[PDB]
RNA sequence: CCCCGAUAGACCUUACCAACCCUUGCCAAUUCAGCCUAUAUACCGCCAUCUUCAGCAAACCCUAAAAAGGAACAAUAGUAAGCACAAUCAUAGCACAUAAAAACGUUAGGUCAAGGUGUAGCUUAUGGGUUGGAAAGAAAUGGGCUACAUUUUCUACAUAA
RNA sequence: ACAGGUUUGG
């Protein structure tokens, strides 16, 4: 019965079913709860169930200048050590069952308006520590492939800006959402505009622009009319540095346009 | 510079019994690969030329044992996996040996045998005649 | 506290004797071998892996304890155990007229805890019939007494004994067979006259 | 424990055959001859029929030692055709390699 | 190495006729037991002690089952 | 030791601890083998090796009182209950059963010995040969020798002769007690030695080895009967073992300090015993070389140390030293003479085969190796010894770092040896300021290593790390570095030097404020000359 | 598709060893055997004993040195003495490494009635051969 | 990786000295044929792939050609074609075109002065010169190459070789030339041997379909064959096998002019007939001139028959015949 | 003898020398199953009680 | 898929059934052992098929926006590590051929019954032992052997009877 | 309206 055993790596690979044939096309996502626990985390190689104290593993080699013989813990001492060992289990499960915190940009279950952090530094060594970026839109884009069929790829729109008038936007598309986030952060700095801000709080004049199918009407406002604009235009102007603005979007409300 | 002195202390006695004689001593060393057998042949011939035994070396034909097993687990018999076990042989033929010379040769030979090879020692013991055949009449 | 000690390569002398570090079969520790050897299949843009952490150099049996200098130094101290072969038997023509009895003895070796090999009990006896004191009737009876154990082309009698457990027992039994086959060939019984 | 209850039964069958090996040999020596009169041979047959069932060497099954598979095992390694492959593909079996010719 | 077989020789293995003295010489017991002795002589796996309880098991079985050997029509001791 | 560098021992305490940990795992595995024998009863090797079979601690027969003791005597506390469980049924014990039982107490094991001694005599008339071999060897360790001289009178009265092992302990039981008198206690040993031959028992090596074991503690002038007994050892025909000469060399070391005339007797005794091959047939041969080479190490004799080493490497290079303590005390004082006496080439030749191979030295040999380089002006090997002393004397670094750098102040610094004075001075400064008392003398060395090297930049940054450590050196360092600042034409350095040096009341500040005036004129810094005068006044 | 002794290729970031980067059809071509004995020869016997002993050594060492074993063991069998070559990570101190080697050197000897040798080569990390 | 290779060369030199020390040869005469010979003995790895064996060479054959640094400490590139991606290949093309224009202008001036001192130095057929392959050019130019640019460079080299060649142009175009092995399939003719006062004695060896045949031929006897001690008529009762014996002899008209004794083993009747046919054909080359042995090899007597029975595949019947495949 | 190997390795795991990841995984899953609430019933009360 | 698990069934194998017995019941211990119980539509381990098809793909870059695409050799935005293909290796000389290999994915394809397994279920029973039986063909069908002969059959035998 | 969800493999 000893030769019938396998390694914990294959045991978890067979238990969690990460490489299952059902979670490939999309039949899964029902029970999206996958957690693998390492069993050798707090397992000292010296301790055992009998409580033997070996001079080479548990206890030091030389005590009082002499050699240590094979000793065994008492029952109450072994109950104390196993009590500490059991307490470490719930100590770790508490750190596991607790979800760390996120900041909601526009609503509790969206990615628009959330903070993504400063962009990654350049190759030459330039660091963008004053730059702050925000996600404007995340969309699961699908493509029809010959073999696999539906090929889901996340497309993300991310805008960077420092608050002094320099701001830009970019689109990053990748199979993974964090990869698209990084592809958009590191690509938004290459396309940076400079927005002339009258007195660093408003725009110089009321602009009424007509894009492809989007009508934007923005009006210059005094110091008391603070950012009464679309929920994404407010974020873009908060990245630019505009503290007072009124904007009205008519026609299509496509985020990229 | 720190060389020990008087390191050789052997215990060799010469018994009055007649030393045994050997006509032909064949050593057939078998292995899986050829490189270890080649280096071992080089080592054996260099160990025999020093003791002056005039060893002869040739290579017997190899033996390949192959078999066939099923490829899948439950049911797939049209697709099989064939395994192979190669066995190469090396023959070292020694002639005109004595009882202690063959012992001192097989001592330096067998103690230094590799792990993946084995050895078949065939000794041709030399004898004149037994006692009841010299000149008996029933 | 972690400690990383450099190997012996930086301390290995260029004229130091090699058999001192590899006296017997060793597992080829890369720290005690000053030769940089690259073993393994290379990468299209890479090179074969170095000796450090190389399982390929650890799978193969190393002959570092059997270099020419070490084998010469070993056999120079082994020259005291062997005896000198008498030159009076340089050719087999004198060996056949002096020692006509040949005893083929088999020996095997195998890696493992057990030593008993059932092929070790086999002892072969080869005697040339042209070297005995057989008369015409003794020879013509001994040929039909042994049968196929004696060949006519080479005229050699072969005894193949495997019944005894021990090799010395099979040897003594083969010599006993030789004695009885030489003796009973001279006894003429009553059924021979017909 | 063992691999399976049937392997636990097979080791017991092999122990019983190793215990009753010599008795069955001496009894078969009385049946596999024609020199003896046929009167005692039937009594020897009843004696060999009175022996325990799990004593005959015919009840032993050469199963795998690893997974106790009753079929598809090789006699040289005492391994099933699956475990033998699982150990030969990892390079853990000396001299064994894929046949290419 | 390490196996001496109780220091026995070939005349303890091949020659087993000295144990057939407690048996009928002219009956079928000799025709039958000479075969088991020819087998024990060519059995290298059994010891000179182990052959003895075999021939003694036959000596005991034949001397225990006396009624069938007398009702078989042939005389045996 | 394992040949891997991660497991190779660095220091001597590590060399001891690794072996002790390995033996601890060997004995831990053997404990499992003995505690669970059924998991190893299956034998696969044909030759049937007994060394790998489990050992049993249980006796076979428990009911039979005669058969229950022969098993328990060979395997302490449980053996004590065997005699009580045998005598509970009033079982008659023979003269051969209780002798081993008394030896089982005389091997392991103050009043329980009396309670056992009454049971061997009062119960049965035991043979005195099985009496003295237990009582004499047991009461010697209990610090009660009075009973041996009482038992000896009954032994001489019972018409049985005394065996050779009895006088091996009676002379100790007589000699160890001294109350203002020595001649009578020495005379009793002569009387027993004279009666030994009358008892028709030839005294073996151990009696003449123990008389010199007794002549060592009491009198330092007792060399006359010791030499006479050593001369009587050669007349009978038995060779004296190594400990016999050791007990002579120990007293000769005790008498060699006031008079060096006795050293020639220590010198001419080893020349005749080095001429043959010995073998360790005496368990007390471990102190022999410890006493025979300490005399040469004390009297500073290397020509004889070469022969006391050749006597070690003649017959058995390892079977003469049991413990590692004496080997470590051996090679340290062996290397203590090879440094300053013979030449540097042979010292460095004997350095690489003794220090990393056999054993690592103590804190004492580090000082001799340092005294070996400064007499012969050897500077190319200072870094090679320095890098080895890191892994060898890392514990004693805080007590040898004051003496390892001092040699550079006595020799000259050639223009080619600059990187060796740089790397070794950087590797000592990179470790102490990052964690360790820092001596002040090393700055006086690092200022002269960089003087002739032409590197004032790296030489100035170091002094700012010492002056901020709340400890100030002597003004000789400042006056020496002022010459480097003068040759490099850097006036802004001495203005930051003296303004922080005069504020702490140095004794040679009057010399520093004079030495700066001469550099200000050649640098043409007369404007900044009086500037610091105003600050020294204010 | 063949899946025996074959590590599937991930996105290009998994570290694999030289023994794992080669398919089983490369044994004796590009890589060798992890064990060497004589039972797998032509006219030799006692092969299954060595196979079960080898698998027991593997399953024993996997538990004896947990998480610190770099790659598979090398079991050399030469003249009644069995050598075990291991590659171990420097996660355990030598004080415990020596305890473990001294414990196994005698446990395996007393369990298999034959002399065993145990040699450890410690590496800083798992050696990467292919993409990492 | 400029310093790593430099350190590997020192370590390889130290390893070479140590190898010569442990092998016992003089380290001065220690060469690569002794290095690989000592490696093959000290580390006898039995593997089928030669590149998987242990090898110790100079680092310049192990490590590939590393690209040199392309810019200084200030960032300015060294070569003037660095911003072209292939600064070595485009520089080679630029030098080739610059020499083509120099040859053109020099030949125009020479034609204007009416002088012809150049010759046709492009026909290198008896030398056996060829152009560089793409791998051979990728070894010279450290950077990678493609197919179209290599064909453009070759097409420019032939344009440069089609013009009146100069002095320094021929040594530049020669360095892109490779000399091609021997293009001769002429077999080695065994000399006539004379053994035991026997004249015109030769021997041949043949093999076809697991049949080994050795044939000795005496050119002084009459026409007859002795195989395995028995004549060919009783050894080959079939007329086809004897016609295989008549095939090589009738081609040279030496029917009643040679005696032959053969020794064939293995295979069947037609395999033995073909093996002895090939052995007799290979043994008759010594008795005949060079023009007719070539007709023998062009008629199929001196070439082997590689047609060997294929191994049966698992899941099939006869290594080609598949099982009855049922569609449903 | 599979029982020898199994008992030896299990006793060594209880003594603290061998680390059996398979048995540890079994004990982890059994602990989480008993904490979920579906454990092993007592012998003598499964069918009746 | 159909001489397939099985390179293999009188008891055993055998997991099936009927009669009977045992329930901390292989192991050092465990309110524990053990289950060939369900789920291959949870899996690992092993395979089938496209498939001797060549594509898959991390990091980047471009597109008057980008779902996606990325090529013109007298070249118009493409560099690309890696896995495949190829090369090499094996059938002891080359070449050919065969063998081997064949990525990412499709068929929720086959396998809880090689082995372990996540989930849900048995514990005086869906668990563990002994004895005896597991037919039979109304019929259909797949794959093979033997033939239905004269280039056949029998005999001696290499093939001229 | 400062807008958001919702057509589709996308
Ligand atoms: Mg919410
Ligand atoms: Mg809308
Ligand atoms: Mg099971
Ligand atoms: Mg069967
Ligand atoms: Mg066919
Ligand atoms: Mg049944
Ligand atoms: Mg059945
Ligand atoms: Mg069931
Ligand atoms: Mg499926
Ligand atoms: Mg392609
Ligand atoms: Mg794209
Ligand atoms: Mg690519
Ligand atoms: Mg080839
Ligand atoms: Mg090809
Ligand atoms: Mg294929
Ligand atoms: Mg291919
Ligand atoms: Mg399905
Ligand atoms: Mg199904
Ligand atoms: Mg299951
Ligand atoms: Mg099922
Ligand atoms: Mg049918
Ligand atoms: Mg079929
Ligand atoms: Mg629609």
Q: Which of A108, A107, A113 is closest to A234 using CA atoms?
A: A113
Angle between helices B34-51 and C68-78 (to 10 degrees): 40
F-facing residues of A in 66-85 (CB < 8 A) are 67-68, 70
Q: Which of C34, C30, C37, C31 is closest to C16 using CA atoms?
A: C34
Residue D99 belongs to some domain of the structure: no
Distance from CA of C30 to the nearest CA of F (A): 8
Instruction: Please tell me which of the candidates B33, B35, B80 has its beta carbon nearest to residue H314.
Output: B80
Contact H94, H81 (CB under 8 A): yes
Q: What angle do CA A80, A82, A83 make, to 5 degrees?
A: 60
Q: Residue F329 burial by CB count (10 A; 0-12/13-18/19+): exposed, middle or buried?
A: middle
Give the residues after which the backbone of chain H is interrupted, taking a C-to-next-N distance over 2.5 angstroms as a break.
180
Separation CA F460–CA F470 (nearest Å): 18
Asked whether residue D70, judged by its CB, lies under 7 Å from any atom of the DNA or RNA strand J, the reply is: yes
Q: Torsions phi, psi of H55, nearest 5?
A: -140, 140
Q: Residue A128 burial by CB count (10 A; 0-12/13-18/19+): exposed, middle or buried?
A: middle
Residue D101 belongs to some domain of the structure: no
Query: What is the torsion angle, in degrees rounded to the nearest 10, for the CA atoms of residue F99, residue F104, residue F107 and residue F112?
Result: -100
Strands in chain B per DSSP E: 21-31, 56-58, 63-70, 80-98, 118-127
Q: Find how far residue E36's CA is from the centre of its chain.
A: 6
Distance from CA of A14 to the nearest CA of I (A): 12
Asked whether residue D65, judged by its CB, lies under 7 Å from any atom of the DNA or RNA strand J, the reply is: no
The pair of three-digit structure tokens given for residue F115, joined into one six-digit string? 């309670």
Cβ neighbours around F108 below 10 Å, total: 10
Separation CA F534–CA H195 (nearest Å): 122
Concatenated DSSP letters of B94-132: EEEEEHHHHHHHHHHHHTT--SS-EEEEEEEEEE---GG
The number of C-alpha atoms within 13 Å of C75 and in the hemisphere containing its C-beta is 23
The alpha-carbon radius of gyration of chain B (Å, integer) is 23
Of A residues 176-195, those with CB within 7 angstroms of nucleic strand J are 179, 182-183, 186-187, 190-191
Separation CA F77–CA F65 (nearest Å): 17
Write the DSSP symbol of residue A115. B
Residue D97 belongs to some domain of the structure: no
Residue D78 belongs to some domain of the structure: yes
Q: Are strands D79-80 and A52-53 parallel, antiparallel or unpaired?
A: unpaired
Separation CA H291–CA H130 (nearest Å): 31
Q: Find how far residue F498's CA is from the centre of its chain.
A: 52
Contacts of C15 (CB under 8 A, 6+ apart): H21
Distance from CA of D5 to the nearest CA of B (A): 22
The pair of three-digit structure tokens given for residue A75, joined into one six-digit string? 């029952």
Q: Which residues pair with A209 in a beta bridge?
A: A216
Concatenated DSSP letters of chain C: -------GGGT--TT--GGGT-SS-----TTS-----B-SPPPSSS----STT-SHHHHSPP-TTS-HHHHHHHHHHHTTT--PPPGGGSSHHHHHHH--EEEEEEEEE-SSS----GGGS-EEEEEEGGGS---HHHHHHHHHHHGGGB-SSS-EEEEEE--SSSHHHHHHHHHHHHHHHHHTTT---GGG--
Asked whether residue A17, judged by its CB, lies under 7 Å from any atom of the DNA or RNA strand J, the reply is: yes
Question: Residue A56: its chain F contacts at CB < 8 A?
Answer: 21, 24-25, 28
Handedness of CA A126, A130, A135, A136 (dihedral sign): negative
Separation CA E11–CA D81 (nearest Å): 48
Q: How many domains does chain D have?
A: 1
Strands in H98-140 per DSSP E: 129-131
The range of the structural domain enclosing residue D59 comes to: 1-91
Resolution for the entry shown, Å:
3.0
Task: Provide the H-helix boundaries in F9-64.
Answer: 12-35
Instruction: Tell me, yes or no, if B106 comes closer than 8 A to chain H by beta carbon.
Output: no
Q: What angle do CA F385, F388, F390 make, to 5 degrees?
A: 115
Q: Which ligand is nearest to the CA of G12?
A: 12
Task: Using the structure, give the distance in angstroms from the CA atom of B71 to the C1' atom of J113, rounded to a whole number.
Answer: 18
Q: Residue A242 burial by CB count (10 A; 0-12/13-18/19+): exposed, middle or buried?
A: buried
The pair of three-digit structure tokens given for residue A88, joined into one six-digit string? 């470490």
- CA A217 → CA A227, A231, H171, distances in Å? 14, 15, 76
In the block, residue with structure tokens 């446990």:
G107
Residue A174, classed as helix, strand or coil, is strand
Question: Which of G68, G97, G117 to mutate to probe the F interface, most F CBs <10 Å?
Answer: G97
Q: Residue F464 burial by CB count (10 A; 0-12/13-18/19+): exposed, middle or buried?
A: exposed
Separation CA H236–CA H270 (nearest Å): 9
Q: Are strands G81-89 and G116-123 parallel, antiparallel or unpaired?
A: parallel
Question: Residue A3: its chain D contacts at CB < 8 A?
Answer: 3, 65-66
Q: How many residues does chain G have?
A: 132
Separation CA A194–CA A202 (nearest Å): 14
Nearest-nucleotide field for A137 (CA, C1')? K4
Residue D82 belongs to some domain of the structure: yes
Concatenated DSSP letters of A137-154: EEEEEEEE-SSS-EEEEE
b/e code A149-170 from CB counts within 10 Å (16+ = b): eeeebbbbbbbbbbbeebbbbb
Name subunits touching E (3+ CB pairs < 8 A). Answer: C, D, F
Determination method here?
cryo-EM
Question: Residue B4: its chain F contacts at CB < 8 A?
Answer: 313, 317
Contact F425, F464 (CB under 8 A): no
Separation CA F458–CA F450 (nearest Å): 8
Cβ neighbours around A190 below 10 Å, total: 10
Concatenated DSSP letters of G1-52: ---TT-PPP-SS-----TTTSS-GGGBTTTB--SEE-STTSSS---HHHHHH
Query: What is the torsion angle, in degrees rounded to the nearest 10, for the CA atoms of residue F311, residue F316, residue F321 and residue F324?
Result: 110
Q: What is the CATH number of domain A114-194?
A: 3.30.230.10
Q: Are strands H259-265 and H224-227 parallel, antiparallel or unpaired?
A: parallel
Separation CA F152–CA D75 (nearest Å): 76
Separation CA D26–CA A127 (nearest Å): 95
The pair of three-digit structure tokens given for residue B69, joined into one six-digit string? 């097993």
Separation CA D93–CA D17 (nearest Å): 32
- CA H10 → CA H3, H7, H15, H63, distances in Å? 11, 5, 9, 15
Residue whose CA is minimally distant from J44 C1': A14
Separation CA F317–CA F353 (nearest Å): 15
Residue D96 belongs to some domain of the structure: no
Instruction: Tell me, yes or no, if G62 comes closer than 8 A to chain D by beta carbon.
Output: no
Contacts of G104 (CB under 8 A, 6+ apart): F25, F29, G60, G61, G64, G116, G118
Contact H169, H99 (CB under 8 A): yes
Q: Torsions phi, psi of H178, nearest 5?
A: -125, 140
Q: Which of B56, B35, B108, B46 is closest to C68 using CA atoms?
A: B46
Separation CA H289–CA H240 (nearest Å): 28
Q: Which of F203, F296, F205, F299 is closest to F243 using CA atoms?
A: F205
Specify the long-range contacts of residues F422-427, CB closer than 8 Å, at least 24 apart: F422/F449, F422/F450, F422/F453, F422/F455, F422/F458, F423/F383, F424/F382, F424/F383, F424/F386, F425/F449
Residue D7 belongs to some domain of the structure: yes
CATH assignment at residue D84 = 1.10.287.1480
Write the DSSP symbol of residue A44. -
Separation CA H293–CA C59 (nearest Å): 53
First-last CA distance in chain H: 63
């Amino acid at each position: 019965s000893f030769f019938t055993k396998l390694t914990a790596d294959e045991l978890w690979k067979g238990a969690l079913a990460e490489s299952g044939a059902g979670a490939r096309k999309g039949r899964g996502k029902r029970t999206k709860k996958k957690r693998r626990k390492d069993l050798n985390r707090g397992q000292i190689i010296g301790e055992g169930r009998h409580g033997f104290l070996w001079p080479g593993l548990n206890i030091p080699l030389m005590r009082n200048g002499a050699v240590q013989t094979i000793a065994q813990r008492s029952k109450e001492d072994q109950e104390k050590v196993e009590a500490d060992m059991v307490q470490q289990r719930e100590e770790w499960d508490r750190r596991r069952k607790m979800k760390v915190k996120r900041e909601r940009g526009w609503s509790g279950n969206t990615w628009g308006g959330v903070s993504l952090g400063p962009p990654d530094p350049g190759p030459n060594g330039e660091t963008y520590d004053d730059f702050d970026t925000r996600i404007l839109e995340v969309r699961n884009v699908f493509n029809m492939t010959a073999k696999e069929g539906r090929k889901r790829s996340v497309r993300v729109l991310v805008a960077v800006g420092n608050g002094k008038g320099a701001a830009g936007f970019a689109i990053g598309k990748a199979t993974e959402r964090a990869d698209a986030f990084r592809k958009a952060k590191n690509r938004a700095v290459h396309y940076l505009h400079y927005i002339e801000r009258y007195e660093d709080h408003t725009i110089y004049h009321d602009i009424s622009l007509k894009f492809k199918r989007t009508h934007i009407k923005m009006k210059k406002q005094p110091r008391g009319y603070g950012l009464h604009c679309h929920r994404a235009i407010m974020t873009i102007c908060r990245l630019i540095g505009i503290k007072d603005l009124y904007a009205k979007v008519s026609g299509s409300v496509n985020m990229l346009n | 510079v720190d060389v020990p002195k008087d390191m050789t202390k052997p215990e060799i006695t010469i018994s009055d019994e007649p030393d045994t004689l050997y006509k032909r001593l064949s050593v057939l060393v078998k292995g899986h690969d050829k490189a270890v057998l080649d280096s071992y042949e080089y080592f054996a011939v260099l160990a025999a030329k020093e003791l002056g035994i005039s060893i002869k070396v040739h290579e017997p034909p190899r033996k390949i044992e192959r078999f066939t097993l099923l490829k899948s687990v439950h049911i797939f018999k049209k697709h099989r996996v064939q395994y192979e076990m190669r066995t190469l042989y090396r023959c070292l033929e020694l002639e005109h040996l004595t009882g202690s010379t063959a012992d001192v040769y097989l001592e330096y030979i067998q103690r230094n045998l590799p792990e993946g090879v084995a050895m078949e020692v065939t000794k041709t013991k030399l004898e004149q005649l037994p006692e009841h055949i010299r000149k008996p009449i029933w | 506290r972690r400690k990383a000690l450099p190997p012996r390569t930086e301390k290995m002398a260029v004229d130091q004797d090699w058999p001192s570090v590899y006296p017997v079969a060793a597992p080829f520790k890369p720290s005690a071998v000053p030769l940089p050897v690259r073993m393994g299949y290379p990468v299209k843009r890479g090179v074969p892996m170095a000796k450090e952490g190389n399982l390929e150099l650890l799978k193969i049996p190393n002959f570092l304890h059997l270099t020419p200098v070490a084998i010469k130094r070993h056999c120079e101290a082994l020259k005291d155990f062997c005896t000198e072969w008498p030159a009076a038997l340089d050719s087999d023509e004198k060996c056949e007229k002096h020692f006509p009895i040949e005893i083929d003895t088999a020996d095997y070796v195998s890696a493992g805890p057990s030593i008993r090999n059932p092929k070790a009990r086999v002892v072969t006896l080869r005697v040339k019939l042209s070297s005995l004191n057989l008369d015409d009737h003794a020879k013509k009876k001994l040929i039909k007494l042994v049968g196929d154990r004696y060949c006519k082309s080479t005229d050699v009698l072969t005894i193949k004994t495997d019944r005894c457990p021990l090799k010395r027992q099979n040897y003594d039994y083969a010599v006993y067979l030789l004695t009885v086959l030489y003796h009973e060939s001279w006894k003429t019984e009553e059924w021979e006259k017909k | 424990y063992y691999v399976d209850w049937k392997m636990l039964r097979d080791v017991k069958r092999r122990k019983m055959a190793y215990e009753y090996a010599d008795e069955r040999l001496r009894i078969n020596s009385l049946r596999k001859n024609t020199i003896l009169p046929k009167d005692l041979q039937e009594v020897a047959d009843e004696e060999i029929a009175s022996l325990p069932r799990d004593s005959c060497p015919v009840r032993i099954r050469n199963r795998c030692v690893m997974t106790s598979r009753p079929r598809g095992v090789k006699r040289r390694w005492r391994l099933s055709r699956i475990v033998f492959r699982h150990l030969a593909d990892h390079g853990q079996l000396s001299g064994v390699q894929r046949a290419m010719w | 190495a390490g196996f001496d077989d109780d220091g026995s020789e070939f005349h303890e293995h091949i020659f087993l006729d000295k144990y057939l003295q407690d048996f009928p010489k002219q009956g079928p017991i000799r025709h039958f037991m000479e075969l088991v002795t020819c087998g024990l002589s060519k059995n290298p796996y059994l010891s000179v002690k182990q052959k003895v309880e075999h021939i003694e098991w036959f000596r005991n079985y034949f001397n225990e089952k006396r009624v069938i050997l007398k009702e078989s029509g042939i005389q045996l001791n | 030791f394992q040949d891997d560098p991660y497991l190779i021992p660095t220091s001597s305490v590590e060399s001891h601890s690794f072996l002790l940990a390995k033996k601890s795992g060997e004995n831990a595995a053997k404990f499992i083998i003995n505690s669970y024998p059924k998991y190893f009863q299956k034998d696969i090797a044909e030759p049937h090796i007994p060394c790998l079979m489990p050992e049993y601690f249980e006796p076979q027969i428990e009911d039979v009182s005669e058969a229950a003791l022969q098993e328990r005597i060979k395997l302490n506390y449980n053996f004590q209950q065997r005699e009580q469980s045998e005598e509970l049924e009033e079982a008659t014990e023979a003269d051969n059963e209780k002798s081993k039982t008394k030896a089982g107490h005389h091997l392991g094991v103050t009043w329980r010995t009396k309670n056992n001694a009454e049971r061997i005599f009062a119960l049965m008339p035991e043979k005195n040969a099985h009496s003295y071999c237990t009582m004499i060897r047991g009461m010697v360790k209990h610090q009660a020798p009075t009973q041996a001289l009482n038992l000896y009178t009954v032994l001489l009265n019972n018409r049985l002769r005394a065996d050779v092992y009895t006088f091996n302990s009676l002379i100790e039981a007589t000699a160890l007690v001294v109350n203002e008198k020595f001649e009578e206690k020495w005379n009793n040993i002569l009387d027993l030695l004279k009666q030994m031959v009358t008892q028709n028992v030839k005294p073996n090596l151990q009696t003449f080895n123990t008389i010199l074991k007794c002549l060592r503690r009491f009198y330092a002038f007792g060399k006359l009967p010791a030499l006479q007994t050593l001369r009587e050892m050669k007349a009978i025909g038995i060779e004296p073992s190594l400990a016999t000469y050791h007990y002579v060399i120990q007293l000769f070391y005790q008498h060699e300090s006031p008079s060096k005339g006795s050293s020639l007797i220590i010198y001419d005794i080893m020349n005749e015993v080095m001429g043959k091959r010995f073998s360790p047939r005496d368990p007390d041969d471990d102190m022999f070389f410890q006493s025979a080479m300490r005399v040469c190490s004390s009297l500073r004799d290397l020509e004889l140390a070469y022969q006391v080493h050749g006597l070690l490497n003649t017959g058995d290079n390892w079977k003469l030293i049991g413990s590692d303590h004496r080997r470590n005390f051996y090679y340290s004082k062996f290397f203590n003479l090879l440094c300053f006496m013979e030449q540097i080439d042979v010292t460095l030749k004997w350095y690489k085969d003794l220090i990393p191979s056999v054993f690592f030295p103590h804190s004492q040999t580090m000082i001799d190796l340092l005294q070996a380089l400064d007499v012969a002006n050897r500077l190319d090997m200072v870094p090679q010894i320095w890098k080895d002393s890191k892994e060898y004397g890392h514990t004693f670094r805080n007590e040898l770092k004051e003496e390892i750098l001092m040699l550079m102040a006595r020799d000259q610094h050639p223009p080619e040896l600059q990187v060796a004075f740089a790397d070794c001075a950087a590797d000592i400064k990179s470790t102490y300021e990052s964690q360790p008392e820092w001596p002040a003398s090393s700055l006086n060395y690092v200022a002269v290593l960089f003087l002739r090297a032409g590197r004032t930049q790296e030489a100035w940054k170091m002094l700012g790390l010492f002056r901020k450590h709340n400890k100030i050196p002597r003004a000789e360092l400042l006056n020496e570095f002022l010459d480097s600042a003068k040759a490099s034409s850097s006036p802004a350095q001495a203005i930051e030097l003296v303004k922080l040096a005069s504020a702490f009341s140095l004794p040679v500040c009057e010399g520093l404020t004079r030495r700066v005036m001469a550099e200000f004129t050649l640098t043409q810094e007369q404007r900044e000359a009086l500037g610091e005068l105003t600050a020294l006044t204010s | 598709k063949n899946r025996a002794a074959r590590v599937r290729v991930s996105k290009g970031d998994k570290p694999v060893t030289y023994e794992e980067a080669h398919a089983p059809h490369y044994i004796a071509h590009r890589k060798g055997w992890l064990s060497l004995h004589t039972g797998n020869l032509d006219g030799e016997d006692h092969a299954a004993e060595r196979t079960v002993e080898d698998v027991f050594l593997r399953k024993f060492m996997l538990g004896t040195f947990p998480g610190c074993l770099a790659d598979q063991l090398v079991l050399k069998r030469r003249a009644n003495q069995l050598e075990i070559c291991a590659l171990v990570l420097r996660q355990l101190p030598p004080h415990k490494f020596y305890f473990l080697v001294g414990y196994s050197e005698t446990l395996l000897s007393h369990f298999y009635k034959c002399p065993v040798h145990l040699h450890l080569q410690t590496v800083p990390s798992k050696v990467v051969y292919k993409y990492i | 990786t400029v310093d790593f290779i430099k350190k590997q060369i020192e370590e390889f030199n130290i390893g070479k000295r140590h190898l010569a020390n442990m092998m016992g040869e003089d380290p001065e005469t220690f060469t690569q044929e002794d290095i690989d010979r000592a490696i093959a003995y000290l580390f006898p790895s039995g593997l089928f792939e030669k590149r998987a064996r242990p090898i110790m060479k100079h680092p310049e054959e192990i490590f590939p050609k590393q690209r040199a640094i392309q810019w200084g400490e200030d960032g300015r590139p060294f070569h003037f074609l660095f911003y072209t991606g292939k600064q070595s290949y485009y520089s080679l093309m630029h030098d080739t075109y610059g020499k083509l224009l120099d040859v053109e202008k020099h030949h125009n001036q020479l034609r204007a002065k009416d002088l012809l001192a150049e010759k046709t130095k492009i026909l290198k057929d008896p030398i056996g010169s060829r152009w560089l392959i793409k791998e051979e050019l990728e070894e010279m130019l450290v950077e990678k190459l493609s197919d179209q640019d290599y064909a453009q460079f070759i097409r420019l080299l032939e344009r440069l070789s089609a013009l009146p060649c100069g002095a320094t142009e021929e040594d530049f175009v020669n360095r892109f030339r490779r000399s091609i092995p021997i293009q001769s399939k002429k077999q080695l003719i065994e000399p006539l041997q004379y053994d035991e006062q026997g004249m015109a004695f030769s021997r041949g060896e043949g093999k076809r379909k697991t049949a080994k045949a050795e044939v000795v031929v005496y050119g002084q006897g009459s026409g007859r064959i002795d195989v395995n001690g028995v004549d060919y008529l009783l050894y080959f009762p079939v007329t086809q096998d004897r016609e295989q014996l008549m095939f090589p002899l009738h081609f040279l008209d030496r029917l009643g002019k040679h005696d032959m004794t053969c020794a064939v083993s293995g295979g069947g009747r037609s395999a033995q007939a073909g093996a002895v046919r090939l052995a007799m054909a290979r043994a008759l080359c010594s008795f005949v001139t060079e023009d007719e042995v070539e007709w023998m090899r062009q008629a199929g007597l001196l070439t082997a028959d590689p047609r060997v029975r294929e191994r049966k595949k698992p899941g099939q019947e006869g290594a080609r015949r598949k099982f009855t495949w049922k569609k449903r | 003898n599979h029982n020898t190997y199994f008992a030896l390795m299990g006793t060594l795991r209880f003594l603290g020398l061998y680390r059996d990841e398979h048995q540890d995984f079994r004990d982890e899953q059994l602990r989480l199953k008993k904490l979920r609430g579906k454990g092993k019933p007592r012998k003598g009360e499964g069918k009746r009680a």
